[PDB]
Amino acid sequence: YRYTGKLRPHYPLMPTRPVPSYIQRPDYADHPLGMSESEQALKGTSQIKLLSSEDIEGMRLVCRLAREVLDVAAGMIKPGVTTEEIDHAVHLACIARNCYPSPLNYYNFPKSCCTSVNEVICHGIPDRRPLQEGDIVNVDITLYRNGYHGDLNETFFVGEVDDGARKLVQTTYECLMQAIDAVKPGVRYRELGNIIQKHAQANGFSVVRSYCGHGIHKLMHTAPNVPHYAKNKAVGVMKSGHVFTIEPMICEGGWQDETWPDGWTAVTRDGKRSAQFEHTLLVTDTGCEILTRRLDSARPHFMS
Ligand SMILES: CCCC(CCC)[C@H](N)P(=O)(O)O
Ligand SMILES: [Co+2]
Numbered sequence: 006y007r008y009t010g011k012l013r014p015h016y017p018l019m020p021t022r023p024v025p026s027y028i029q030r031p032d033y034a035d036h037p038l039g040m041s042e043s044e045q046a047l048k049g050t051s052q053i054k055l056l057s058s059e060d061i062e063g064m065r066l067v068c069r070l071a072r073e074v075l076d077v078a079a080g081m082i083k084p085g086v087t088t089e090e091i092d093h094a095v096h097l098a099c100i101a102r103n104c105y106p107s108p109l110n111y112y113n114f115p116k117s118c119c120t121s122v123n124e125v126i127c128h129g130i131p132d133r134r135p136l137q138e139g140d141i142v143n144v145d146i147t148l149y150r151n152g153y154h155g156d157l158n159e160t161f162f163v164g165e166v167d168d169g170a171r172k173l174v175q176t177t178y179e180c181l182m183q184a185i186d187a188v189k190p191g192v193r194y195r196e197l198g199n200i201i202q203k204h205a206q207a208n209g210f211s212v213v214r215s216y217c218g219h220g221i222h223k224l225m226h227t228a229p230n231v232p233h234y235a236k237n238k239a240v241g242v243m244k245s246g247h248v249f250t251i252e253p254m255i256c257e258g259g260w261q262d263e264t265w266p267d268g269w270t271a272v273t274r275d276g277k278r279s280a281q282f283e284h285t286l287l288v289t290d291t292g293c294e295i296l297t298r299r300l301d302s303a304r305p306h307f308m309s
């Protein structure tokens with residue numbers, strides 16, 4: 006394998022972290038290949054679930070807890086801390102909240118969160134590499150509680166970063182907020198990518214195409230599929246009761262991605278940097294509730 010950038014995996018990994026048996030587990034947790042019976046059963050569906058009041062409560066809770074855990078991880082970002090150390094803290098933080106770390110054994114994913122440094126687009130595996138001054142790092146948190154998953158991520162600065170890093174992360178955040186702002190009943194899911202690409206491109210960045218936002222509730226990933234690029238073919242129209250994510254990945258260079266031989270780590274083919282933010286959103290009668298919103302600050306971590 007020829008790496009696309011300077012980053013390399015830092016192995017061996019610590020042995021897999023166990024979750025106490027009293028934490029309720031999603032169906033794939035114990036599947037030998039980490040496959041989900043219920044996602045298999047609904048694979049290929051276009052029908053978007055209208056959540057019940059009890060579902061909405063379940064989603065509010067799990068998403069609030071996911072936010073808390075992401076916030077635990079943000080508090081750790083600094084030069085010298087390994088992504089593994091971050092994952093350990095995130096794993097304990099999930100357990101402490103009576104939640105299962107959703108990524109753990111999802112299609113055999115080895116860790117409890119995704120850490121994506123620099124040219125990693127998404128799904129980086131926490132490992133022995135210490136964070137370095139000037140890195141950007143996304144931490145992606147997904148938690149599972151009482152039958153519900155809650156999904157969010159933020160990109161962070163590691164010490165002082167260059168102007169190019171500032172601009173990429175800022176623009177990425179602005180792309181997310183511009184898309185969220187459009188969400189309300191009657192809007193086509195395919196329109197969000199127009200908004201995202203328009204802003205990214207205006208700033209000289211490209212929009213990853215291979216990974217999309219998604220419905221989320223009882224399944225981790227389900228309808229609708231939500232592309233972040235312009236003129237996509239997404240099916241569906243927003244209605245009050247819909248729950249989905251928007252999670253744009255934006256890049257310094259080209260949009261093209263490839264996967265490391267670990268089967269997960271998605272990197273820019275050119276080796277240039279990529280940033281992402283993600284919220285889980287509930288469509289309301291009037292607009293949208295940001296279920297994974299920070300409660301104790303109006304701003305994401307990179308802005309302070
Ligand atoms: C590799 C795992 C993928 C998933 C989380 C897994 C439950 C991510 N949080 P995503 O949907 O890519 O935001
Ligand atoms: Co996520």
Ligand SMILES: [Co+2]
Binds near residue numbers: 219
């Ligand atoms: Co997601």
Ligand SMILES: [K+]
Binds near residue numbers: 122143
């Ligand atoms: K990245």
